[PDB]
Amino acid sequence: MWFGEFGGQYVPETLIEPLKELEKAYKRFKDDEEFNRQLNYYLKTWAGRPTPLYYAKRLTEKIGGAKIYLKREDLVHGGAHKTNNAIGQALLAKFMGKTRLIAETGAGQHGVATAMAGALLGMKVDIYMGAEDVERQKMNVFRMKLLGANVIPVNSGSRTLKDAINEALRDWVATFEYTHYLIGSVVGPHPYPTIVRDFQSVIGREAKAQILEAEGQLPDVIVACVGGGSNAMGIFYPFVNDKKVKLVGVEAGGKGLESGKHSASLNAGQVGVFHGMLSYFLQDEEGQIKPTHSIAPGLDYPGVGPEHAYLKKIQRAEYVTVTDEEALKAFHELSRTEGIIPALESAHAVAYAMKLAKEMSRDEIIIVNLSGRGDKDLDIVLKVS
Amino acid sequence: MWFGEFGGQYVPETLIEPLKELEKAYKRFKDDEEFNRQLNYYLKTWAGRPTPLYYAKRLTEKIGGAKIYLKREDLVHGGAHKTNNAIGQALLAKFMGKTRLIAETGAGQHGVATAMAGALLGMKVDIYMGAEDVERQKMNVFRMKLLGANVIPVNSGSRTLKDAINEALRDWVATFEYTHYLIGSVVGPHPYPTIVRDFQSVIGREAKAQILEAEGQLPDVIVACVGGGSNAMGIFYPFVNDKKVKLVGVEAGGKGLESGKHSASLNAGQVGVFHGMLSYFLQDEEGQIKPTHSIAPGLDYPGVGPEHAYLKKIQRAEYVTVTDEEALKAFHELSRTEGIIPALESAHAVAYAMKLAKEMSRDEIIIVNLSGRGDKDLDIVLKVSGNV
Ligand SMILES: Cc1ncc(COP(=O)(O)O)c(CN[C@@H](CO)C(=O)O)c1O
Ligand SMILES: Cc1ncc(COP(=O)(O)O)c(CN[C@@H](CO)C(=O)O)c1O
Ligand code: NA
Ligand code: NA
């Protein structure tokens, strides 16, 4: 329920029944032999797990400090980590007898992943997406439809990610007998922050195994970008009890923190209650939720997961920011130097890892979670660069 | 050098030295333990091999005949099988002491693969691309640029793939001491068609272990699309000596064979000599290479590799065609039924397998090589199928 003070389940009474059924089903299926056989079978033969851990030798040499390894979630079916959680939850939904999935999306990547998993298991899929975001993600919207999903543009409020979540929640309240709301990050009311993190943890368990094989030891640092915080919790969580391993989450600095055009909830947001949870949110002087900005469309959620707020508060992980300009420089550098075109979200983690490696010893190890590939971001990079 | 009467090395004398050195080097390194340790290393940690073999149960059941498995080359780094050969040849180049790679590309996929492998290995990269292909493939051109490669638009001739290969050959003549010409299909003068097949063979070796593991037996049929022939050679070759296993190559039927707008060299071309090889080409009465058509950008080469001409000749493999319309329907169908968006090239193989499956027993097994993912093809599909 809670991570320290954060998280919880602060929702109208109409949400209580769906959430308790979900928790009950999850408790029942998460260790069910049959459910796991099927989940691993799809993650293996359809998504292509495990993903490799890649030693970025040229990058490491050029910077001339710590060894930089990349956990290659860009190679997952779909092009991003989102797929791990979409498969997990869609299968859960199927085991509970649901026939339809809904999900919110901002950048379109979780919408695409959800559509994919829906098509895979033969469920109807409706994706709520703010109309401002539908307009900026033309090709992800088209992918979703090719996959047989319907895209419902959300015209209420600020027409953006928070608003799509709101409508998704209203729908679920009416339709949960046959619908599962497939939340895309480690946010929302219990049990979603736990479920999503459980379904992303596969990343860290692979990465731990792979780095022991490659180097005979655990990494000195793991670096991941933080929107809502799923890919970061995914790779962090299996290392939480390893005292040697530093954990660094990188948030969107946008045009700079001072500019007020960014998406850095942990660094510059306030603690508050929204979307059924107590965590950090970016809000105005009136207290209402504030619009975010980043060149990375996936770093758009105006809050962060509670388990991160918790890891911050107990100082188990550190949270930093990287600006638009720095992320873009990193997108280019990784492309030219290692022949890997990263997602612009993931480029934030790369840029921070680049700065940190420089200060570190050649004997030390950084693992960078490469949350996604950059194909989806080409139009954006074309326009700016 | 020869696959029955097909193949050879039909080049001006200037190119004999480069091809000689390459042949020497490939023989040396093909079995070098260090070369192979490094190659396997990059294929695993950077390219993401092995790719899985996926049972399309929903597709299979909807069609109600044979089981359809998909070899998922769409999951390889870069999104197509091209990467396997690109890494192989770029490594070979680097072991030969070369510092520059050149390549030709039509669809742009091999250009991208070449740029990626050159970036990986710290080599300079120039890609030749017909100006008409450049215009149709802005995003792949942009990808190549981002990867640090230089794209050279070819304005001579038809301004298309054949012309890019001609320009690449002239470059290599002048620059072979330090440059390697990274040919992207099982085509060109010996030793290229052997080498590329050898480097794509991993696909079939995987698929073979994976199917024994999933089903305890070999497939009844393997279906792959055929442009130049590399993805098909890759998956066919380790099964050639398994009498049981049918091999089916699928060529682009375009607007239909009777229309003359297609790219079916084996089905409707002639024996000819271009690009240093004796094989089947689409060429007119005055011996000139014809323009090709397909909705799939990567099925644009106006010929086919000599090893395919050989298999057709001895009847080890059958070669069919699928139209644009059939390929498009299959593209939509795989996306909707299995949540996998295929490349339009690979959709030709899928469309054929769907037809074959219908005519087969539920006991039987078809492996389809899914040569690439459809991300690169979304603008084409948007334009042709329309928005939804
Ligand atoms: C490739 C990639 N990397 C990182 C993130 C950030 O989210 P996370 O912090 O849950 O991992 C996203 C989020 N993308 C979400 C929010 O916009 C989506 O709806 O698509 C992403 O698509
Ligand atoms: C995804 C995909 N699948 C199949 C093929 C056909 O080539 P093959 O028959 O050599 O495998 C191509 C070729 N594409 C070549 C020729 O245009 C290129 O230069 O990119 C492809 O890109
Ligand atoms: Na945020
Ligand atoms: Na052809």
Question: Is B355 known to be catalytic?
Answer: no
Q: Residue B386's CB: how many other CB atoms inside 10 A?
A: 7
Tokens of B199: 């480097």
Residue identified by tokens 């550098």 is A333
> CB–CB of B283/B290 below 8 Å?
yes
Q: Are B189 and B11 in contact (CB under 8 A)?
A: yes
Q: Is the dihedral of CA B11, B15, B17, B20 positive or negative?
A: negative
Fold match between A3-47+82-200 and A48-81+201-385?
A: yes
| A317 and A236 Cβ atoms separated by less than 8 Å | yes
Strand partners, B365: B67
Interface of B with A (CB under 8 A): 44-46, 48, 51-55, 58, 72, 75, 77, 79, 115-120, 122, 139, 142-143, 146-148, 332, 335-341, 375-376, 378, 381-382, 387-388
**How far apart (Å, rounded) are the C-alpha atoms in residues B229 and B304?**
6
CATH fold of B3-47+82-200 reads Rossmann fold (3.40.50)
**Domain range summary for chain A, segments of one domain joined by +:** 3-47+82-200, 48-81+201-385
Residue A56, token pair as written in the block: 């970025």
Q: Cα A338 from chain centroid? A: 24
The CATH number fitting domain B48-81+201-388, selected from 3.40.50.1370, 3.40.50.1100, 1.20.1050.10, 3.30.420.40:
3.40.50.1100
Residue A365, C-beta contacts closer than 8 angstroms, at least 6 positions apart: A66, A67, A69, A211, A215, A217, A218, A219, A220, A221
Structure tokens at B57: 């149960």
**Alpha-helical segments (H) within chain A:** 16-29, 33-42, 57-63, 82-95, 109-121, 131-136, 138-146, 161-175, 192-200, 202-215, 230-236, 265-268, 306-313, 324-338, 344-359, 378-384
Sheet strand arrangement including B150-154:
B150-154, B124-130, B100-104, B179-181
CB atoms within 10 A of CB B159: 18
For residue A91, the CA-to-ligand 3 centroid distance in Å is 28
Measuring CA to CA, which residue among B374, B313, B317, B323 is closest to residue B348?
B323
Experimental method: X-ray
Per CB-CB distance under 8 Å, the chain B contacts of A147 are: 335-336, 339, 341
Mutate to test the interface with B, among A68, A74, A75 (most CBs of B within 10 A): A75
Residue identifier of the C-alpha nearest atom 12 of ligand 2: B298
- Residues A335, B129: Cα–Cα separation, whole Å: 21
- Sequence-distant (≥ 6) Cβ neighbours of residue A158 within 8 angstroms: A130, A132, A291
The structure tokens listed for A34 are 């049959």
Nearest CA to ligand 1 atom 10: A230
Q: Which residues of A350-378 are buried (b: 16+ CB within 10 A; e: fewer)?
A: bbbbbebbeebeeeebbbbbbbbbbbbbb
Distance CA A220, CA A246 (A): 6
Q: Could you count the other beta carbons within 10 Å of the beta carbon of residue A238? A: 18
The single-letter code of the amino acid at B179 is: T
- Judge residue B33's burial from the number of C-beta atoms within 10 Å of its C-beta, 0-12 exposed, 13-18 middle, 19 or more buried: exposed
CA pair distance B375, B188, nearest whole angstrom: 29
**By C-alpha distance, which of A19, A12, A39, A378 is closest to A194?**
A19
Q: Helix (H, G, I), strand (E, B), or coil: what is residue A55? A: strand
Resolution of the structure, angstroms: 2.0
Residue that the structure tokens 């794209």 belong to: B151
DSSP letters, A358-385, are HHS-TT-EEEEEE-BBSGGGHHHHHHH-
- Round to whole Å and give the CA distance between A25 and A260: 42
CATH topology of domain A48-81+201-385: Rossmann fold (3.40.50)
